[PDB]
Amino acid sequence: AARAMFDGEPVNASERRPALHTALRRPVGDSLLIDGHNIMRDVHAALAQMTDIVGRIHNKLWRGYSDRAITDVVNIGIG
Amino acid sequence: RLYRHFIAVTSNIPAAIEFGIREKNIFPMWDWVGGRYSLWSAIGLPTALAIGMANFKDLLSGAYAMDCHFRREPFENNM
Amino acid sequence: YYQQAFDVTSLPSWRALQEHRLAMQNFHMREAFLSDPGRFDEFSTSSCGLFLDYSKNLITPETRDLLVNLAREAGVEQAARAMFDGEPVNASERRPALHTALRRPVGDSLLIDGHNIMRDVHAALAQMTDIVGRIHNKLWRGYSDRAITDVVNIGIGGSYLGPELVSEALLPYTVRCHYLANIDGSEFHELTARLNAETTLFIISSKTFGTLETLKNAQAARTWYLASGGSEERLYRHFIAVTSNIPAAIEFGIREKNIFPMWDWVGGRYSLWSAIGLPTALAIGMANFKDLLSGAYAMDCHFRREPFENNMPVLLAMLGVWYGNFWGAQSHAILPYDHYLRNFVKHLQQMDMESNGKSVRQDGSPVSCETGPVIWGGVGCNGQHAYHQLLHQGTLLIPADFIVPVVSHNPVADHHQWLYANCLSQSQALMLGKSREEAEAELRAKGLPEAEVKRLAPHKVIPGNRPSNTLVMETLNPSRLGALIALYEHKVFVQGVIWGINSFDQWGVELGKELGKNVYGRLTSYEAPPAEDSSTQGLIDYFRGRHR
């Protein structure tokens, strides 16, 4: 079962989906093919986007409508 | 000028677009990643904004090491 | 010398030097000093503000005669004439080496292909004067129309080491100058953590405007400026360039009037006298920059006019050839006893090692001797507690070049007297040493028992007979610093002439570049072929198994 979940098999039988939270932690040298598509490319593209935004905000390079640096990030989300 | 104060982590790019969020500030959400298993993906974007991308990658590396331990160890030493 | 290459080991002077080395096998400098009270007078020389003491060397008057004979037989005088006159001494690249031209005054004319390059030199100098006067008088303003006070030089190699050395050494004559060389993003982050985009002016120093690390750092700086509030149409007030690629700097967004020229005949490691030293002039002023140029010019005149027995560059180069080719010394320590001169060793490393680190002659034939040692060292009075122990009691022959001034710019009680005493004592301990008898006598005077004396004596014995040179100045001003740098440049040139090599090409840096592109493509791409070797492939896999 662990092999199936790590390999991308649709272990979420009710929703007919894979459970690939482990894929989010794999390094750039790992490749996982889901329906013939390498989802690790999506994982690391999202990671690079995350790095870009984090570096922008941390270096005070992100500014609001008054063109002042932002120092309060508020996550609106549940669960 | 709303785009500098609202980014989104979502699978609904059009909805975030009509909210007034730029496409380059919309982070992808995937079906194979469950909500309660998604702190490793762009959902953990605030966390990376607090600890930095190096520490976020360190967290990912620790989770990956645990994945390797789970996959490789015999069940008598599998934590 | 750059057209017809001979074997220097076949010269009669070389064979005479081999025989003299066999004879001098048993030579000890201590005995030469007790048997010759005039040794210092015989083996010291002066040139402008520089004083070279080379008496603490494994030489006799016969040794200096033979070394001067070898310098003459190799054609050092004619080679220096050719280099100073604009002949293509860079045979491999078919270029002249005219770093000396950068220090010539306005009355000097040098024709290269029927064109007076001194006009270019002094036009660049006048442009430098204009920009330095604009910035110093707070007449240069950014995109917020505020005066600039942070000049950041984005450049590597010769665009970084020489200018930074002169900026640090000439601090008592000083707008804050910073340097950004490493492609390591941590250096860029640390630098820009102290910079305001409205206030910082960037000098992009790249010859072809295509150097990987320099272009990456310049692109990062432009992105930082744009994302810090600066506007694209107004970028010109924060980015000037020293380059031979005017169009590239043009599409970067740099005005043509802020583009300083780089010439082929000026090597990168020999270019602190040209517009590459623009940050230095921005820190010390144009008068002090011209004083540095005048000191370098005075050293050039001393090199060209003096007989080889009193020619400081020729004497230093011949001592280096002596120790590296007849005593098997593979390294040369540079010990400047001045806190401002602590970065002298880095520039000396580039200048000497990138130039004389060759294994083919000017025509391409393999060399017949050792050409180019390792340059190392560090600031004085700090290396005594760090690595002078190996100099005193190690098993290696490491010639040392001590550099110290007589006058300190910031005297603190008797600290400079102690610094001078420490430099002199290090040289004297290198030459003298401590024998078994002296160590035993000191232990007995300390009252230790006979068994303890005989146990401790061998460990305290310093062999001595370690050669050293001392360079003394009255003060480290721009003029004497320029003379010092030019003296080491000419020493490197003379050594390269003796070894028959090209001191002005760097062909050993291209393979690393090609392999860097290959390794980067392997690191980033997903389905890449295996690397050429399993070690590079394993390191690529180690990167890929950990990078996110």
Next chain:
Amino acid sequence: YYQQAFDVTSLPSWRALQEHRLAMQNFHMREAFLSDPGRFDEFSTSSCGLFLDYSKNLITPETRDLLVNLAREAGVEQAARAMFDGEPVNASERRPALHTALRRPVGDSLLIDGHNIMRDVHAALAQMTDIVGRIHNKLWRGYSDRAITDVVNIGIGGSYLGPELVSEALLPYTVRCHYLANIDGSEFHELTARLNAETTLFIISSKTFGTLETLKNAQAARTWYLASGGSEERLYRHFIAVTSNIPAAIEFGIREKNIFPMWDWVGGRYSLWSAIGLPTALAIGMANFKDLLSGAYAMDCHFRREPFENNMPVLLAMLGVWYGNFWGAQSHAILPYDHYLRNFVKHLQQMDMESNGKSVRQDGSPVSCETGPVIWGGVGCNGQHAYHQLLHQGTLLIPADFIVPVVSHNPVADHHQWLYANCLSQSQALMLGKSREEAEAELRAKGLPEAEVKRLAPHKVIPGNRPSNTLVMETLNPSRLGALIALYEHKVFVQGVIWGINSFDQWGVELGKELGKNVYGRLTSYEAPPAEDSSTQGLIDYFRGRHR
């Protein structure tokens, strides 16, 4: 090994290594890599967060077998047991070398003369924690009752290099720490130009509290504090000391509770783990300092437990012995490809050169081999444009140690990918080289005529076959930096054991001190007797003819 000294060159393993060197004369690493796809796997090892690739070396499996045999025959395992257990391995000074004890946890007990020195270690650690927590929480105040934010370490040698290295390398984990080592008054002036006497706290780091330069700088700092408004009775809040001379620090005006202990069994160059690293703990915190100690302790455990074929310190030391004693390499380059690790080479220079720069064995007999090379190098991607040309195309054999992390603390676009690629490509170009055929083929592909091709080909040829080691980490954190420092400490120890020398005494620094007192007395006094040599006398006269 510190009591009975033998001749290492007489060991059968040494003679086997000589025969193997004769056999390996014609060995080329490129051929070994095309003829063995598993070479990287065979010649790489890991330990905690450190990965050592030593496949790009002039070795075969037989070479590693013979080097491990020599390490066993010299008694490296028993010597390491003796050093770790508290035996007086410093035979000349009759002291133990217990820098490893400084990294042991509270559950470890080590009895020296019936006393548990680990109690002292952890009492000092708790004192360090108390002071660091006081200063970090702004609970430490000066004579104006204002919080201190500038900690200045007045110390030289081991009190300066190691702490400053760890402070700079662990910057992403950081009160500002400054260092004042040079007796040069210009350094003191530059330092105090940024300091407020109401705010600066000085740590006087001197073992005997009698070191010339350290005492002079401390006296200058005390005078500066008194003349800047501070009061004598309240001086205690600006001067703490790390010293073995409690009374001297007492009459300086330092409280006994602010005097940190220095022990004889801790050498100066091995003391960044003790209270000497107090400034470092003041910059990174006590948790990160303990993480550094834990990494060093993990490296100690790896050194003590691993077989010599997978023992990273033993492998590095044996490769160094191999190249320095059988291939005639007199220097070793250290190339850290990390901007924060740029000062690694200075501490490595002190650690290696002051320890292994010896020419007598533990019993005092002369050594029978070369013991201790020159350590040099510099920050990565900066030396490629400075001195890697000599590495690629020079005539010297210089083994190189590349150090690079996989993850950057401050990523800037793809700059760290390029840094990693540059490190890997430098190693690969060192191993491979470019032959005449490859250069000619590239020139032909560029379209150059045949005459131009044959003129330019010999100059572009890189010989290759230059050995190198690569040390990789995931990230440069306190733990892995501590492991790296401890690995190099153990490598130095193993090399000193192989050479039969004392790696923990420094007897080559006393003669310079005595001669410094003599030269200072001659410089200052009016009617002084002439110096022992005419060169020192002439330099004294040059000083006297210009000093006012």
